[PDB]
Design a protein around this ligand. Sequence first.
Ligand SMILES: *C(=O)[C@H](Cc1ccccc1)NC(=O)[C@H](CCSC)NC=O
Length: 271
Amino acid sequence: AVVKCKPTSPGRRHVVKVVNPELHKGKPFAPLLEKNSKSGGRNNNGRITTRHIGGGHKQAYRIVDFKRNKDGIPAVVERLEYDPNRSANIALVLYKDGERRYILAPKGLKAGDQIQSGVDAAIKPGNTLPMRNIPVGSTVHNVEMKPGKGGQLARSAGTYVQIVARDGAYVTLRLRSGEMRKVEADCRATLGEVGNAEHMLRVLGKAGAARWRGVRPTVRGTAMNPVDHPHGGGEGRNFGKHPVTPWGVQTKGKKTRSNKRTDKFIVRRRS
RNA sequence: UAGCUAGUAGGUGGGGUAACGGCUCACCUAGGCGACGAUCCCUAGCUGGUCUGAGAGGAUGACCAGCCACACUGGAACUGA
RNA sequence: GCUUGAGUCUCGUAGAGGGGGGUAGAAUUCCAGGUGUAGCGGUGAAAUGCGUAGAGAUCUGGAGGAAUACCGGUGGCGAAGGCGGCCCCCUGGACGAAGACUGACGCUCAGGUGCGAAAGCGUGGGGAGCAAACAGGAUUAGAUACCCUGGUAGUCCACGCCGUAAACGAUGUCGACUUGGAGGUUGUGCCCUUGAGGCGUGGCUUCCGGAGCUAACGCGUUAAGUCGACCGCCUGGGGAGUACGGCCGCAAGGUUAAAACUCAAAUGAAUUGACGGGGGCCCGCACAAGCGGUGGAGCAUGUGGUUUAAUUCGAUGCAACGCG
RNA sequence: CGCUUACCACUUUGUGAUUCAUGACUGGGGUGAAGUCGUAACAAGGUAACCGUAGGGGAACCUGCGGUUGGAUCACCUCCU
RNA sequence: AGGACCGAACCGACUAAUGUCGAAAAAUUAGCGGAUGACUUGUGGCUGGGGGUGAAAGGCCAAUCAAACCGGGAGAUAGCU
RNA sequence: GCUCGCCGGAAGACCAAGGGUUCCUGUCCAACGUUAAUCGGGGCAGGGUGAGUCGACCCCUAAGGCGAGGCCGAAAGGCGUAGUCGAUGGGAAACAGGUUAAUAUUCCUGUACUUGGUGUUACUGCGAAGGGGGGACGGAGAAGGCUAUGUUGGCCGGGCGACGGUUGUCCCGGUUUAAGCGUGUAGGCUGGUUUUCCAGGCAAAUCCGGAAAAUCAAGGCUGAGGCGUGAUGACGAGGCACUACGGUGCUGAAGCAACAAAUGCCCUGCUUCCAGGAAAAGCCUCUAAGCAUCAGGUAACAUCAAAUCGUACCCCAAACCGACACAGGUGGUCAGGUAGAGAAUACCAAGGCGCUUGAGAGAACUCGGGUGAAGGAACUAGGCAAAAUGGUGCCGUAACUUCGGGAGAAGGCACGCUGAUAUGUAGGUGAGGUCCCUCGCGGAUGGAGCUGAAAUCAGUCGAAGAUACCAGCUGGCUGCAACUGUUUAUUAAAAACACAGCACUGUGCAAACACGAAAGUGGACGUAUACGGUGUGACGCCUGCCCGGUGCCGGAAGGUUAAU
RNA sequence: AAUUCCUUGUCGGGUAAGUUCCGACCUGCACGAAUGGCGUAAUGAUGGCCAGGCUGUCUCCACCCGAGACUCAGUGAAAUUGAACUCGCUGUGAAGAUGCAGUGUACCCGCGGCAAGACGGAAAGACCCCGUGAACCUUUACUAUAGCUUGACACUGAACA
RNA sequence: CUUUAAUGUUUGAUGUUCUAACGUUGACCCGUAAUCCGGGUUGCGGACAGUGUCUGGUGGGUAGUUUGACUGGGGCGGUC
RNA sequence: CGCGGGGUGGAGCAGCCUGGUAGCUCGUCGGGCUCAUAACCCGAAGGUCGUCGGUUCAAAUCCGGCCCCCGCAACCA
RNA sequence: AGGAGGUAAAAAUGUUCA
RNA sequence: GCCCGGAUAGCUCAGUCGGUAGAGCAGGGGAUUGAAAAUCCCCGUGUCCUUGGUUCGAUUCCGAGUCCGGGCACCA
Ligand SMILES: *C(=O)[C@H](Cc1ccccc1)NC(=O)[C@H](CCSC)NC=O
């Protein structure tokens, strides 16, 4: 629902609201609610390790089941929700044994669906099962690298991964960035792309709109003095230096990929 | 040039004119005109006739004559049939 | 009142007519695994690019998006644009048959409304191949062209907008009449189906031509023939389908639509010629197959150029230059 | 008669519309015996043309998409009774 | 609905005068801007000296900041007064 | 003591904070107060702070801190698990009146409530650092129902009046009443009830959750205010009475109704949008390891206990922070009358003050203001400053445009008072009566009373009817920046910064990057529609040529090439 | 032009008069397309210009009401200063004389005012220079170093091609 | 000597496989009601990764410093 | 400083590992080429092959030593 | 008779009138 | 003013062993064609700013007067 506003006031004219009429309007489910402390971007020492973080709206963390290890138990999707600290909608599922859980909402979804996690479920949106049972070529999400880690990749709006090939006990995935990383074949994956994919079409419109998301203003480099930023200085607007980070490392073209304990898993790299 | 008008469309009563009438006031009705062209803008005295043209028309309206209008510009009124 | 107008009902037929949803096969591109080795790819030739990290080629499997081989036909349908692998649902139009019914409800139509190829545009997805812009190699007097290796938007789908084409049989629509032949296409009637059939009756459509018309070319029962009904539009060319304004459009612009000026032609058909890196037949020491020369050396002779008091004048593509 | 009320022309104030000249300067166009670059169209104009549309380029023009004919030409050579 | 409008509280600090051994080591008076938000404010915590924080002025970090304050090197050094 | 003037959404009356006896009385006047001083926040002595219900302590928890073991680091020390602290948060219980020189929801009178210990009686299964429910919550907006409170009338009491009138539609004062208990309303929330079963809730579970049948239609919960009661009580204007003449004692009528109405309460509601809105304990309930003639629990009753600290005074200021008895700053609550949209403003009430140097004079000059003939920016760096416009309703309103605006454009008309329309209309509220009923705080009908716009007409006064305080200057051209916003605290508020938006680039999770010798954290309990860095800075049309230099990405065969 | 040295360039409008303003001409000292270019409705305690209204801003000030200034009583400072019996003038002079020379002039002492001087007071000039002073800042200045990165050895082994 | 073919041999490396070192911010159990940690099963990587010592390169991110004198003031030019 | 590499008509660049050939193109003269211009296609000028010495039948080449350039590690009077 | 595979690179320019 | 670049035919401009001066167009003629164009040839096109010296010879190599442009002309 790409609802574009009308220019009634300055700053309002560019606000495009993505509304979801099927989302539950009521309060969240208390049993799965746990507080989520805002950090401001400070660590143990208290220093600001990451800039541009602060303020924003208070929000509560809704524990999400990523593991999907309730082996062989049908469950119906009670309702669709809104999760602040995430780009994707979350669904409240109810199992046959009478237990409620939060799973990420896939694309082909609707309140009244029935899913089930395990190595027997049908190749259909929402079902979870190991990757060595799925047809090679199927599109999944919420996959992992460790057999039971919980689910790492493809965890945002409209995000999916395509199981490209099966080599031995490893599965090649064409990632969102355009990678091709082999992951352990026994890692779980939830079929179907993640819904709420119109998160991209949204435009905040105001400077304050970002301020309640928690994005404090980013000060440009060439606006400071020489002591603050390796760009700084200048009489009146002149750069004359090579674009670097606040800490000398040259940005715009410096592949800092350095782990080497994982280059054995990357078949094809981002291009 | 696509809508225009508000004493403006009509009725009633008084008044007014040599005479009828919104000609003019008061009240009531909300109508009246309009694509077979209203309002607006530009232009222009009209006609008998004149010139031309085989005819039909086209252009035109000076000299003679009929009529309307004007008399430095605009407004009002009297005298008097 | 009636009926030869027109409209409606009953049964069926043909059809890429239209919308929505699944599905299928071949091929292309990409990716993974096995096999396997120096080329692959391309052109007028070459190169860029791809490759010994192991391509291309080959086999297996998967992934997607787009377009539907043969059927296929100057075949069919639709108002036109335009529409074709298969299947279901929803639905529009036309046509034939033996009858009936209503009884002119008809036709046309400024304004107005809708649809309206492609390209393009906004919002959102998708994105194989192909491919504006762009990059590189060539070609080249120059190549911001044609050729070739890649390539963003786009081309496709949903909802709006745009409203324009050589949107063209350059032919408005409706109705009537006006010699025929040769095919295709779709109903239908009768006779012996006595065999790939024979003879009539309607719709659509292709080709050729008679009358007649037309400037000619040609149209020619789907007419540009003979008539009637109503509408749009045209009044020399360029200016210009341009300006100003209005109206519509997010934008690109569209639409309605001049004047001054300048020229006195512009234009169409057709014919005699010429020409064409158009075609066909034919011919030549033209080529082809050869022999000997030329151009390289010295020299004779003529011309141009230079020079000179004059170095007479002419001739000066082939067709001047041992010529006068 | 004077005073006074309604009516009322010249005129003033503010805010629109329309139109005539003028206006530095500028875009495009018409026009002009022998200037510059290239050669786009006319034959198959040497990449067929043209129309519609977008982008591109010192200039005509170029490329992509769709459409039309107001495009020419169909002979020579390998297979089969 | 609104980083919407006018406008008190509240917050801020554009103009002018006053004040400048002041009432005050940046205030007063008369006018100003924001005033449902990127708003303001109370209480309690957290980040620290070549470090913190900074809608970025080299501004702020206890009336002190192009590197705070306190103590110690240390009676630094001074070709200068 | 009598007049006078000022504040009155404060200059009033109270808490937190923070001070620390400044509070009250007697007395003293050197020093302190910018003057005098029998005066005082000054000196001296004495007096004063009374709590089961207020707050803190207490129980629990946030940000965050410390941190047994543990990990890491030359040492110091850093981080952090179990735990243990930490309110500005959550959790039991009281109100009215009187009294002091000074204290009081703290003492006294009266009337109540809450949480535990122990004991008695009758029943019944109780029982965790464990589970579930609850606690438990966002912004904005509108309405309805009420109350604080105010006004008016009736009623009671006093007056009838030093200059004209005033026994009457007259004047002044009063007309006060809480917590608790009972009813359970306006309104809101949720469909109740029984049975069987179950891969769920680290174990178990009758509790919560889930799946099918059955039964009836409502039950249950929450809930301001009102009405009774509290209360034939207190209070209460005014008198009766003694004065150290400051005040004490005694007594004490009326004490209702109507209307208006909050930012207070219902509201920890309802509608809606999105940026999606603490935690734990108290409390309720079910069981595990267990304990069952027990122990405990439920209900009623009796008795006992409710400890310790603060409590005085100031709290928009001479008592706090500013060196001062300083024109500055300081969070929260209540906040009346008339006019008014209003917590603006003006004048007043309650209440509190006249700011701790005054008396004369009436020069220049200065500061703060008023008015000004004629002209109206000629002043001047510049219309700086003053002046002016200033409100509500109606009419009317351009270029341009992102079609919202521009715009309150501009510019005009009417505004008071009286009467009439109408012995105050429309409207709002609304008693009695009548009827019915699943009978209560009910619903229709009904209309007295009360309150009360605005519009039109007529009349009238003045120079002026938005008459005061209050309260836009408008228009045109154009540069720059989109806008709200932020900044040099204390000479620069801007075109600077930010900004949503656009783009390139880095990053595949043990992520990049950052703090940190390290561990570990932040990034993020996020994972490419995500995060970091950089540049530009809405929106519209676009963004051209160049790879030598430098940086970067990639291919490395050859040359050079460290340690070894 | 927030950019044009020459320059107040040239032309047109505006004014009686216009180094500014506004629209253009290109001679761009030395604009230029994300250190973004050119437009742009609205917004602006923003920059420049114009007109109306309006006034003491001004022509040229006049008057008046209050708080000071003044007088009396009480309390009672401050910056500063070598010592003073502390005049003008011309000249001299470490080069601008209250103090020297010459000369004129001038009874001693207060109060209210005004500011030309006492190179008046305040701040051991911040301008300029010096110091083989300091401090931060920059970089393809020198020498180092955190970090990132390369190779050898150790933690670190077994096998066949 | 230039150029080359098989083999033996001396070393640098590469390919692949394995599990025992090691890593493990994978799952499970226990210490324990505790996402730290430690240990034990087990899975996945695997002699890599990562760390130490020596060493080359880059390195204004950070630190310590130099950056002449004469001079009709100083800078510039010139000079020594 | 010592392992590398490179010097060619007036400029630009092959012949360098293999000794015998001084060329391929831009620019200038000419010849054609066409009817003519231009364009392509050709044959010559013009290089002490950096200088000196020297193995061989014969030198740009393989060889020597030294002047002149540009890239590295270097260099503590 | 009936239908398919194969089929040439470069060539710009020529002033006014008759 | 000084550091620097030039004055050349009618006009605009070439030119560094130190060697008696050249280009195009303008003007005229000729070839030119039918008349023109286009193109070539011919000719006049001269104190080489002015003023000096050495020299076989001076525009040239250097000094000084004139004329025309770009820059030292920096801070306080
Ligand atoms: C030169 O301009 C210096 C710089 C300066 C300005 C202001 C204060 C201090 C220094 N001007 C002065 O030194 C002035 C004199 C100006 S005369 C040209 N001195 C002030 O005290």
